Design a binder for this molecule. Sequence first.
Ligand SMILES: *[C@H]1C(=O)Nc2ccc(Br)cc21
Ligand SMILES: [Mg+2]
Ligand SMILES: [Zn+2]
Length: 160
Amino acid sequence: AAVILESIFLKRSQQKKKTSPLNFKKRLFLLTVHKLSYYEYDFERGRRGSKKGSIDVEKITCVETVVPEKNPPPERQIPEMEQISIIERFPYPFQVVYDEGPLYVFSPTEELRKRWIHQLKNVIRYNSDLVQKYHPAFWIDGQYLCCSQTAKNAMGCQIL
Ligand SMILES: *[C@H]1C(=O)Nc2ccc(Br)cc21
Ligand SMILES: [Mg+2]
Ligand SMILES: [Zn+2]
């Protein structure tokens, strides 16, 4: 359908097991009123490559910022040459909460994260399962850092 937003983000992959070590992938994200989709970006030709996956907008319960990592690697650190840094540095995380727990996405800028959150909140406005609570920190190594709850589906420890 009609593309609301199109961006290059760093995403934290869903793992085989919660113990398994984290993997981050650079992908192009597409937002429509029906889907949040992601692709392997074709840099050379300047196009979206292969679709890797999608989340139905109706399945989204929450969209918020996430408290940043205590000590991120350079790829997720605050930058400097604008065209370059907007595709190399991804310091601003946000979460897309759905059926299969939270999806963690890293924006190159604060402004782009704000645009994505603003638009994602609007496309989810008429959803049923919209939660009023959320986890401000990341689920990492079998637990959320903000409340120590050990279930990805656990109810939010903070009111939004
Ligand atoms: C990233 C991943 O590992 N799995 C998944 C599913 C849907 C989206 Br939009 C993104 C990701
Ligand atoms: Mg560089
Ligand atoms: Zn929490």
